[PDB]
Amino acid sequence: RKGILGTKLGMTQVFDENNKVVPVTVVKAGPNVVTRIRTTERDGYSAVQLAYGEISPRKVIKPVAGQFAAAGVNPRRHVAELRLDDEAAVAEYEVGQELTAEIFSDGAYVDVTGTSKGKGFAGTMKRHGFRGQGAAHGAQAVHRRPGSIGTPGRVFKGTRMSGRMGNDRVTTQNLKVHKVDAENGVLLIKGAIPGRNGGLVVVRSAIKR
Amino acid sequence: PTYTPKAGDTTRSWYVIDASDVVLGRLASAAATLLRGKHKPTFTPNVDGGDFVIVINADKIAVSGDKLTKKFAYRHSGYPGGLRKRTIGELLEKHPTRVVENAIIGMLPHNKLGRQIQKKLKVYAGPDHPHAAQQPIPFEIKQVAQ
Amino acid sequence: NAAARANDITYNRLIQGLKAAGVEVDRKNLAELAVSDPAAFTALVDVARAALPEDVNAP
Amino acid sequence: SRIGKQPVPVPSGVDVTINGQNLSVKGPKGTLTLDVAEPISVSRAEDGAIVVTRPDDERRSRSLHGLSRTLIANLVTGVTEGYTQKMEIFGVGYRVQLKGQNLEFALGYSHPVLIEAPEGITFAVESPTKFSVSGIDKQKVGQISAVIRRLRRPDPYKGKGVRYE
RNA sequence: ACAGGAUAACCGCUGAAAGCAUCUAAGCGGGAAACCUCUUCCAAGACCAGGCUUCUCACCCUCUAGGAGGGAUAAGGCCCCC
RNA sequence: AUGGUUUGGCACCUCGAUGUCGGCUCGUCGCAUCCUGGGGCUGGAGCAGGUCCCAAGGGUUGGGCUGUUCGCCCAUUAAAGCGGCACGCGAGCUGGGUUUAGAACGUCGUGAGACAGUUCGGUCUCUAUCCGCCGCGCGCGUCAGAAGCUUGAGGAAACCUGUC
RNA sequence: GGGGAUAAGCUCCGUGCGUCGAGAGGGAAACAGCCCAGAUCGCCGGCUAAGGCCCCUAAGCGUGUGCUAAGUGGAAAAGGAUGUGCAGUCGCGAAGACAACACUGGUCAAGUGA
């Protein structure tokens, strides 16, 4: 399973060779530098840690700067881990190695992971798709409230009631990569990927396809 | 009046119990008695003057009957339909130590003092333990003949 | 009971042996002996052992 | 019970090793290993045989005694000459042949049917209609024979499919 | 979803008690949207309060020198601000 | 023989108050399974059924008439399951029915009036203390103070299906 | 004993019957009416009742002889059923019994049937 860190730029329109339209989301799969190797003999699990983003050296605090110096690379803004399956899979990464966009190929299926947009304090109508009550025929101030809550006289756990919504990590599966522009380090992914423009995303080879 | 332990009176010793081919209930009761401090003449229900207990070869333990595949360990998450059950077989092959831990914990009091006593029980599926530094005394389950 | 099992005898057999031996010390002072002076308790255990029948399960 | 009391003869040319209850036998056809139940011990009788000695007469042991005897007999006869199962087809258009180590049939399904040959068995096909499998262990041979038998639902009407001799 | 594991009804293999037989009491296999994994998410207040690292890694005063109390700092954080 | 899902019987519980039917909104559980899944014998040729075991993961439509549940019907569908939970749910909603006072018809009564007969109309109150539940913080703890990246015991979500 | 469907935690009578009412204490997990036992007060003394003695929980992972494989113990019927222990019978049988290869003959080798 390959992987890379990127940034959501926006969505646009392209046409394939059958003249059909493809709505594509542009992701800046920028250069990532491998900072640490997680090994079973040391950490108990095999994983690779990638750094992304450009940040001023005067902005990083001392612990982070020390970690990056121990790695041997200049600091970056964002750090994340890719969990592999076994040592044979992680043997192909070594610290300081640079990953760019061309690890993916045209037509590949990818898994983009991002943080959903925030929606604030949301009612059950919006948070859970509850059907409302009547807007007329005598309904009294119940046009949007959940209604019943339903022996022990107890509201069971998991009640789908109102609350804060959004701002959760979301994975969209089996997205097709329409084009891999190597010059700009840009992936053209058919479909809509989570989060707002300028947010961090993780692009991974699909686990299913 | 009756003797009462003071601040510095309690002394602890470490026993290591080999659970290979030992009846689960028997070992659980012996370890519970050891943890409670019932074997000491200075015993007092108020104080946890027990001893630290190490149990090795937890996976080799003996279960009679057909309880290996017919006795269930239950737990409820609290959500509706959150009841999960595992027989002693899969519990043993997945978390070997949990069977002995549950058995021993069920046989000692359910107060806060029981919670403090639980801290003095260490069980391990392997034939060895990392507590060699304390020099535990090997302990064998005998019966006082009357 | 704890102190008697420390001397390889059960509490009930110890009490029966003490009764047969005729010693008239009660449980309060028996516990006092067990906690304070283990030597006296061991001696009492021996005298109770002597006072017991040879086959306790005999009719 | 009755069968168990009779020691099973051991041919001279086949090596028998006894390690408590773990019994291993090296024969001309190959080697097979058997584990005996704990209420019964087996000792190789010096006269070229093994002794199935049951020391108790409670239901478990008395039932296990003859079973252990016949299991040992099966093991020795399977390591000495092996075991052979003969098979065939009835009907028309049903073709069977061996493709290397793996067996391919065309029973009439829209897809070709393949069977994987496990260890210890081998497939013989001297005719498309009739063929055979042979091995050193009777249990495995029977299991694979039944598996290949399963390739068609039973036909009480025409009897088209496969049946033993 | 795919794939794996243990199974239900069921189909079986190898066979005793019960000289034969018996999918069975010893065993070994197949077998479902159910079960365990697998997918997504939360999760160390998981009191057994985890792990891999990286940074600071030092200066006073008081009571009585047993411990405590107070002050000033580092890495860092918060408040104020946009 | 089971069950307390149907009418019952008792009057143990409340008259210094335990909302009475349907409907809406939102559930949760059982399996005595409607579809989908695995089976077996067929008085099963194939198709398709009949009947029966396992199986509760998901799903189980929109309208006409009636206050209705029930029920009949109209179109579909893979299917249009049966039940428990104060015959779930009015400090969540409705007030069409029932169940005050107005009025009329039929019948009973000399009459005032009456009818588990009908007909039209007819106030549904409350700022959430505690438990519960959905979210969000503050404090302290995790044996010096901090900061990155994480393992996961343990939980939650999802699980449908047709035509060609 | 009657009424009711010999159903009710139904209802109505009899009882030198009991308990609660008006009764604590111990036991039955909790438990007015069941079992033990009637509290004058104090004791950091002893023996017992019912009930109990692996751990929770005081006292026995007591001793001896047998039984149970069902977690029976630790809920229930009509009925069904090559489970097993004991005892009692009968049928057949070394003239070779049963099985195996309706009733008869040969191999075989002790028990075989209800």
Curated annotation (Swiss-Prot), chain A:
Gene3D superfamilies tied to this protein: 3.30.160.810, Translation factors
Keyword Protein transport attributed: no
UniProt KW keywords: Ribonucleoprotein, Ribosomal protein, RNA-binding, rRNA-binding
InterPro entries referenced in this protein's UniProt entry, alphabetically: Ribosomal_uL3 (IPR000597), Ribosomal_uL3_bac/org-type (IPR019927), Ribosomal_uL3_CS (IPR019926), Transl_B-barrel_sf (IPR009000)
Biological-process GO terms, alphabetical: translation
MF term (GO), any: structural constituent of ribosome
Gene Ontology cellular component list: cytosolic large ribosomal subunit
Keyword Ribosomal protein: yes
Reported function: One of the primary rRNA binding proteins, it binds directly near the 3'-end of the 23S rRNA, where it nucleates assembly of the 50S subunit.
Family named by the database record: Belongs to the universal ribosomal protein uL3 family.
Subunit structure: Part of the 50S ribosomal subunit. Forms a cluster with proteins L14 and L19.
HAMAP family for this protein: Ribosomal_uL3_B
Protein name (database record): Large ribosomal subunit protein uL3
Organism: Mycolicibacterium smegmatis (strain ATCC 700084 / mc(2)155)
Classification of source organism: Bacteria, Bacillati, Actinomycetota, Actinomycetes, Mycobacteriales
Gene encoding the protein: rplC
UniProtKB/Swiss-Prot annotation, chain B:
Keywords: Ribonucleoprotein, Ribosomal protein
GO molecular function, one term: mRNA binding
Pfam families, per database record: Ribosomal_L13 (PF00572)
InterPro entries reported for this sequence: Ribosomal_uL13, Ribosomal_uL13_bac-type, Ribosomal_uL13_sf
Residue runs in coiled coils: none
Protein origin, superkingdom: Bacteria
Entry GO terms, CC: cytosolic large ribosomal subunit
Gene Ontology biological process terms, A to Z: negative regulation of translation; translation
SUPFAM superfamilies on file: Ribosomal protein L13
Keyword Ribonucleoprotein applies: yes
Function noted in UniProt: This protein is one of the early assembly proteins of the 50S ribosomal subunit, although it is not seen to bind rRNA by itself. It is important during the early stages of 50S assembly.
Binding partners and assembly: Part of the 50S ribosomal subunit.
Similarity-based family: Belongs to the universal ribosomal protein uL13 family.
Designated name of the protein: Large ribosomal subunit protein uL13
Curated annotation (Swiss-Prot), chain C:
Origin superkingdom: Bacteria
Entry's family note: Belongs to the bacterial ribosomal protein bL20 family.
Known function: Binds directly to 23S ribosomal RNA and is necessary for the in vitro assembly process of the 50S ribosomal subunit. It is not involved in the protein synthesizing functions of that subunit.
Protein name (database record): Large ribosomal subunit protein bL20
Residues of the full protein shown: 66 to 124 of 129
Swiss-Prot record, chain D:
Domain of life: Bacteria
Pfam families, alphabetized: Ribosomal_L6 (PF00347)
Keyword Ribonucleoprotein part of the UniProt annotation: yes
Keywords: Ribonucleoprotein, Ribosomal protein, RNA-binding, rRNA-binding
GO cellular component: cytosolic large ribosomal subunit
SUPFAM superfamilies: Ribosomal protein L6
Alphabetized InterPro entries for the sequence: Ribosomal_uL6-like, Ribosomal_uL6-like_a/b-dom_sf, Ribosomal_uL6_a/b-dom, Ribosomal_uL6_bac-type, Ribosomal_uL6_CS
GO molecular function, one term: rRNA binding
Keyword RNA-binding applies: yes
PROSITE patterns: RIBOSOMAL_L6_1 (PS00525)
Any one GO BP annotation for this protein: cytoplasmic translation
Purpose: This protein binds to the 23S rRNA, and is important in its secondary structure. It is located near the subunit interface in the base of the L7/L12 stalk, and near the tRNA binding site of the peptidyltransferase center.
PANTHER family: 60S/50S RIBOSOMAL PROTEIN L6/L9, LARGE RIBOSOMAL SUBUNIT PROTEIN UL6M
Similarity section: Belongs to the universal ribosomal protein uL6 family.
Subunit structure comment from the entry: Part of the 50S ribosomal subunit.
Protein name: Large ribosomal subunit protein uL6
